[PDB]
Design a protein around this ligand. Structure first.
Ligand SMILES: [Mg+2]
Ligand SMILES: [Mg+2]
Ligand SMILES: [Mg+2]
Ligand SMILES: [Mg+2]
Ligand SMILES: [Mg+2]
Lengths: 22, 542, 489, 139, 139, 124, 137, 136
């Protein structure tokens, strides 16, 4: 008999960055 | 068949499709065109899919075979494919039957982002079985999915499930038909006006009418159980049930009930009249719209100094307008993950659709569609994507299913020029600082329920406060109330101490004029002259 | 005796009546609903914060109603064999329908309905579809009602909320003062108390506790009494004498101590560190002290007069002045003395590198604040988080702008706005946005000036209240000599 | 142990937790110590994995519910409690939180005596000076 | 190896660590060398991925806990010592942090001799000069 | 290939790399050409993804180990390469494959089975 | 076709691709039609499976493994011009694409389809072919 | 328009890349003054962004040979604020100066799908309105 499986792999994120302006 | 209502055209099409290949196929052979076998149903949940399928099965009398979506799997090695094969074999071998697969998405996920070899197998087996469509069988398939987009596109191929029928949200006539159909077994009182109830059930769709009826019956039954054959649901009972309930789709986004009347918003009379005309005329004079042939505006932006009352007008519209209303906060849409933001904006606008009329109040628009000047600097790199999604979903709304989005920002200078373009959000209402008459109106509207002494002349206060904003007036009134409450507390404490060793029931029945006089010593204008200048400059420039 | 009757639940009389009606009337008086003509609703969803009484309500219904009762734990349905969970659900529903007219209780359905669109599990999507089909479809139900309990209703699948599947959604929310009194009387009907105990004062002084929180209070009070009287009596494992074992009694001091220790479970994550300050510890600032004290104590202690006049109270306040004058000291005094809950947050504490998590943190903080209301929220150095918009050419996606906009909407928007007091403390209010300074958000702008001679003397007396001093020493000269000093100096 | 319960099969972590609690309750009045719960309770709101949500809900239901616990006390240990689902930080589930923090001078002296009672020492060594000069040691 | 343990499945990497440690302990008093722990230990505070947190917790429970270790020693290697969970750097898990840094010129001479001894070279080449010349070249 | 071996599944790209190294070491002394190493070498400090640091550690484990097998790499910008990778035993020799006579030689070798001054900007 | 390449046997898709390519090289200088390439080529960046990557690598090494004595060409039709691997659009496999953006073919399709019914006696299919602009197939 | 050199420049660069890709084409630059602004001297971040935009436009328009036959059409209300560096010969030399009949045609194209009264003439509105525009 066959069977299933549970698996959670990953996701994605979108960071933010502060800069310095002359 | 008569039980299902509000879907005249779709029901006629389904009836033709199901009867012609099942009642007399001689004419189909004579013409030569073979009517299709697979039939799909699409639309919001509860629209009537299962009811319509059961009504077609009963009205036709053809043998039936229900395939519960998630019930096709099995425990033993390799029995789902055999189960589906034997189901189709019995459906063909027994008679010119009809097979109905409920929740097709549960079985035909897709052929791409679909793992689970067993699942893929079952999908391919179903695709093949539907591929082997022999007209001599005289068996048609009816599919009913509430998620028409997430279907395996191979099933959409010609030869299997080719004709779709978008059973959409019922209209006013459909709502009246559904109300009449559902209210026939119930003993309705004489005073009930189902036509009025249907004209008022603006955003209700399908099951929502049934919910309204059930709630009304329950309320009446409790109303007369607390106090036999003298049992009847009245118009006031049905009105109460309708007021309690909300449209089923927009259940999740149901805002908490904050009361506000059109007389509570002091001042801004012409602005409120124009807003009421703009929101009610497109929804009440369709004959006028048709005769004119001009597309009504589908947006508005309030701009002005802080505290002028933009959110108050939005609340008044949400309370008094006879349509649904979904409030959105600026940063609320943003999400950490990649894509989630635009997905949430799309879900919000989709929910706004399918329940027309709707009113999406976007508060503090300088957070959703801000002027994205900085681009060279790398940051989130998603604000442009959000702005583009909002622009596409504000410019892409169809003329049908009018959904007017009201925007509200305190500083319009940061609002991108794109959204303020014709078609997306045209009308720009400016809420100026109240004048003396507006200030008097605001004060009288805010002190409606406040008991006050007989000799109070609010006109003097208004005449004195000249540059004061509505928030300043609210602060003045709250300070007066606080001083009066303190005086009452002190008097009550003194009286209680004396009796422990005397004022009346209310030591301070009314807010004293001296109380307001002392309260107004600490009041000042909320908006300064630089901000007033900048807002006036923006107004005259635009 | 331990069986919980329908009277055990308290503070939720309305919801109790609604659930009792839906569960009993279609069974006690079916004739009434056949006479009216239509069938009653057959689905209920309980939702609210944890520790409010939903599972208690399930126990009460199970104990009271004589009909069959079937229990489904949330994840319990899942299994290892392929396509077996749906078999389990079918078995449960068939047994429920077959045996008798019955009530199924499906606890923690949140975990089983991941909305079917954000979820990616195959077994999960099949369990959702199998539920939908069993709940509604060809031969959906026959004299069976379903009760579900959840803590996050927005996670439930939209198809499950429509009429026909879950007709009524009851909100088991935070109790009110009368609810707290009823809960206290319910929980203290079995434990033996000293007659001096006064439950009304305890219910008044409890401000955000819901259900299990009050239960914890009672338990802790009892344990304090046990560890107050188990000291005089030795260990004595063999036996404890009758004289001590009886006539124990629970004094009000135990309840006060347990109230001084416990805090609402919702705020357990943001509980402030203990600090010992008092009002007499603050020298000078008499008028500001009394104004703040009355502005915080009036809405919470005298609600009838406010409702008599039909006007809402003032909420916000902003201290501003030169550094080292006593702003944070006043905030500490309010935190320790005033009865309302305290959430102390620093200025730049809540910002985060990710996209949107600053505003998510702000929304969570304000949601907690209005959840366990009444609360006072202390925003130290408001010029850090609330700056003018559009000032900076280069920015991290306008995060500061979105933060200030989120603050504006949370402090004033489409919310109930029952009772949250925002106190701001910044020594440079020029960077504060005018929208924030507008009345209705922070309406009271209190300037904390430099102390004069009598205020400097008051401060010196306040600061020397716990130090032994030369009896001949006087402070009047020191006060007369400092003319520009501050409290820190 | 914390991550000891997780398994690849769908519906097996919760089965393991159920088996553990059933074994604990079926035998005698027992004590359950769960170490490093910060890996099992990821707040069920910030996490996105379905199996994590399901395990958290299983633990919450097994801990509190109908016929929840019959004479078993549960102990948990964590290095960061703020990253736990609030539903677990409630009375009935985790009634009371003890804070085992940095010891003081007396505690450090006690620890030194405890750890230097089986080893041999000279007579010139005094522990009080060591506990005084030792400042930030966590024990 | 650093990344060889962890897998995409739910609760399999933790099984890899458990299998490794159990086989070692059952086998004999043994040494366990782990390379590039910085890939396994992202400090549980900057690691969004939940499998990472479970791996760190399982490792912590293996080294530290009830009867955690017996006659088995552990050695770790990371180019970036800072990039590691502070709970690991505590005594009992990783007691002593030894730095194998750049050697002195004498160490360079030793390295040159060790390399040179097997291979065959002309008699004119002297190692002392070359070693003195190469100051920063390591290993 | 660089972007071919990288995936979102945890521990699958490293398993594929280990499988490739075992197949290269199983049959014979062979030549491995791993192309575009700069996508899977983010210098372990500028990146945010865990899989990139994990696959650099996988390359360092499989590379340093080898039984008579030489590896070749390929990149455009050599500064985004881990120092451990550019070490002796892994990438101990760096070859700069960057004129008119070479372009004429390429024209001669490209016109064997089947202009050097005008095509001044042709890479090859 | 696209999704007709999967079989119960694991990896059988590569064996089917090799069998088809060796049959087309064995029989004659011919032409291969690969319909619905969007199922075989999932653009290699948004996908997460492994047998899709394996069958894409097999199709790449089979399009690349054509010598001069094969003399076979391949034709492939697609719906969207964006969900294609750039490794499949590289120089060597697919470089000459056409952009099919008529009335005679529409009249031919009409006379093919509608000639099996008792139609009418007063019909002019030239007007239906002229007034029909964007229909296909 | 973006922050400054780079993103804005890359936008104009890939706009002209799409233009040279879809040869022949017409690039209708609406409101030329807003883009050019006669770079001159402004001495700020906005001045630097304007100068970089003008330099990108000049170096991506002057590189158009007889091949690829693109055609840029500009339109403005104020011709005073346009850059003389963009009104030079060799880049953009034509100057079309731009009525009653066009106003009547605009009113007749705007009143196409409208149920107008039959007894109504628009020549009175055309003669009364002289310096108006299609938007008004
Ligand atoms: Mg249905
Ligand atoms: Mg507002
Ligand atoms: Mg509960
Ligand atoms: Mg301070
Ligand atoms: Mg330990």
């Amino acid at each position: 008999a066959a069977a299933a499986a549970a698996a959670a792999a990953a996701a994605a994120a979108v960071a933010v960055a502060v800069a310095v302006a002359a | 068949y008569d039980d299902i209502g509000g879907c005249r055209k779709q029901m006629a099409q389904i009836r033709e499709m199901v009867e012609l290949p099942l009642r007399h196929p001689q004419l189909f052979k004579a013409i030569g065109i073979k009517p299709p076998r697979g039939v799909l149903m699409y639309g919001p949940p509860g629209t009537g899919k299962t009811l319509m399928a059961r009504a077609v099965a009963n009205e036709t009398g053809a043998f039936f075979f229900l395939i519960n979506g998630p019930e096709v799997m099995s425990k033993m090695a390799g029995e789902s494919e055999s189960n589906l094969r034997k189901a189709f074999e019995e459906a063909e071998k027994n008679a010119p039957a009809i097979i109905f697969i409920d929740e097709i998405d549960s079985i035909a996920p897709k052929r791409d982002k679909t793992n689970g070899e067993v699942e893929r197998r079952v999908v391919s087996q179903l695709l093949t079985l539907m591929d082997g469509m022999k007209a001599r069988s005289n068996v048609v398939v009816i599919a009913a999915t509430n998620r028409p987009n997430s279907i395996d596109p191979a099933l959409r191929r010609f030869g299997r499930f080719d004709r779709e029928v978008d059973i959409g949200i019922p209209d006013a006539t459909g709502r009246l038909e559904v109300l009449r159909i559902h209210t026939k077994n119930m003993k309705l009182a004489d005073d009930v006006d189902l036509e009025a109830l249907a004209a008022e059930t603006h955003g209700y769709v399908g099951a929502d009418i049934a919910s309204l009826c059930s709630e009304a019956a329950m309320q009446q039954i409790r109303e007369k159980m607390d106090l036999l054959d003298s049992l009847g649901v009245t118009m006031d009972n049905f009105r109460f049930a309708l007021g309690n309930s909300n449209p089923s789709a927009l259940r999740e986004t149901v805002v908490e009930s904050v009361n506000v009347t059109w007389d509570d918003v002091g001042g801004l009379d012409e602005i409120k009249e124009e807003l009421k005309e703009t929101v009610e005329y497109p929804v009440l004079h369709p004959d006028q719209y048709t005769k004119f042939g001009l597309s009504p505006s589908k947006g508005v932006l309030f701009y002005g100094p802080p505290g002028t009352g933009k959110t108050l007008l939005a609340k008044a519209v949400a309370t008094e307008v006879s349509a649904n209303f979904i409030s959105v906060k600026g940063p609320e849409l943003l999400s950490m993950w990649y894509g989630e933001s635009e997905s949430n904006i799309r879900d919000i606008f989709d929910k706004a659709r399918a329940a027309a009329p709707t009113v999406v109040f976007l508060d503090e628009l300088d957070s959703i569609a801000k002027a994205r000047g900085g681009s060279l600097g790398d940051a989130g790199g998603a604000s442009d994507r959000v702005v583009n999604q909002l622009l596409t979903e504000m410019d892409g709304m169809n003329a049908k299913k009018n959904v007017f989005v009201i925007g509200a920002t305190n500083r319009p200078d940061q609002i991108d020029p794109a959204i303020l373009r014709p078609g997306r959000l045209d009308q720009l209402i400016y809420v100026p600082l109240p004048d003396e008459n507006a200030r008097l109106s605001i004060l009288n509207a805010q002190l409606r329920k406040t008991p006050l002494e007989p000799g109070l002349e609010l006109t003097a206060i208004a005449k004195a406060t000249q540059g004061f904003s509505g928030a300043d007036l609210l602060y003045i009134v709250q300070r007066a109330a606080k001083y009066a409450i303190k005086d009452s507390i002190e008097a009550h404490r003194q009286h209680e101490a004396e009796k422990e060793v005397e004022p009346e029931v209310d030591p301070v029945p009314y807010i004293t004029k001296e109380h307001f006089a002392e309260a107004m010593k600490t009041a000042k204008r909320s908006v300064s002259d630089a901000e007033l200048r900048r807002y006036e400059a923006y107004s005259q420039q635009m | 005796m331990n069986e919980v009757g329908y009277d055990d639940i308290g503070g939720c009389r309305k919801q109790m009546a609604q659930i009792r009606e839906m569960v009993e009337l279609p069974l006690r008086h079916p004739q009434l609903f056949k006479a009216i003509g239509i069938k009653p609703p057959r689905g209920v969803l309980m939702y609210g914060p944890p520790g409010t009484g939903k599972t208690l309500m399930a126990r009460a219904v199970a104990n009271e109603t004589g009909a069959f009762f079937f229990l489904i734990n949330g994840p319990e349905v899942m299994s290892k064999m392929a396509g077996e969970s749906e078999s389990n659900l079918r078995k449960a529903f068939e047994e429920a329908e077959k045996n008798a007219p019955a009530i199924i209780f499906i606890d923690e359905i949140d975990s089983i309905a991941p909305k079917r669109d954000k979820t990616n599990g195959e077994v999960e999507r099949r369990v959702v579809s199998q539920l939908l089909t069993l709940m509604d479809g060809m031969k959906a139900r026959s004299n069976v009602v379903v009760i579900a309990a959840t803590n996050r209703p927005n996670s439930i699948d939209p198809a499950l909320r429509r009429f026909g599947r879950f007709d009524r959604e009851v909100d088991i929310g935070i109790p009110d003062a009368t609810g707290r009194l009823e809960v206290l009387r319910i929980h203290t009907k079995n434990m033996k108390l000293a007659d001096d105990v006064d439950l009304e004062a305890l219910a008044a002084e409890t401000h955000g506790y819901v259900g299990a929180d009050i239960a914890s209070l009672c338990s802790e009070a009892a344990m304090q009494q046990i560890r107050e009287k188990m000291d005089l009596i030795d260990l004595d494992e063999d036996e404890i004498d009758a004289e001590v074992l009886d006539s124990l009694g629970v004094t009000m001091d135990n309840f006060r101590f347990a109230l001084g220790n416990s805090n609402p479970s919702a705020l357990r994550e943001t509980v402030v560190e203990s600090v010992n300050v008092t009002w007499d510890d603050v020298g000078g600032l008499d008028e500001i002290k009394e104004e703040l004290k009355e502005t915080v104590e009036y809405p919470v202690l005298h609600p009838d007069q406010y409702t008599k006049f039909g006007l809402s109270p003032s909420k916000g306040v902003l201290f501003y002045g030169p550094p080292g004058t006593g702003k944070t000291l006043l905030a500490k005094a309010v935190a320790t003395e005033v009865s309302a809950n305290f959430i102390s947050v620093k200025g730049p504490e809540l910002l985060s590198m990710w996209y949107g998590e600053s505003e998510s943190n702000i929304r969570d903080i304000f949601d907690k604040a209005r959840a366990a209301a009444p609360t006072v929220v202390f925003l130290d150095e408001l010029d850090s988080i609330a700056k003018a918009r559009g000032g900076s050419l280069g920015d991290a996606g306008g995060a500061s702008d979105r933060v200030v906009n989120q603050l504006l909407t949370e402090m004033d928007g489409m919310n109930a706005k029952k009772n949250v007091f925002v106190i701001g403390a910044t020594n440079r209010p020029d960077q504060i946005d005018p929208a924030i300074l507008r009345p209705g958000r922070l309406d009271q702008l209190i300037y904390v000036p430099l102390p004069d001679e009598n205020a400097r003397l008051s401060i010196l007396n306040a600061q020397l209240r716990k130090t032994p001093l030369e009896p001949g020493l006087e402070l009047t000269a020191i006060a007369k000599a400092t003319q520009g000093f501050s409290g820190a100096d």
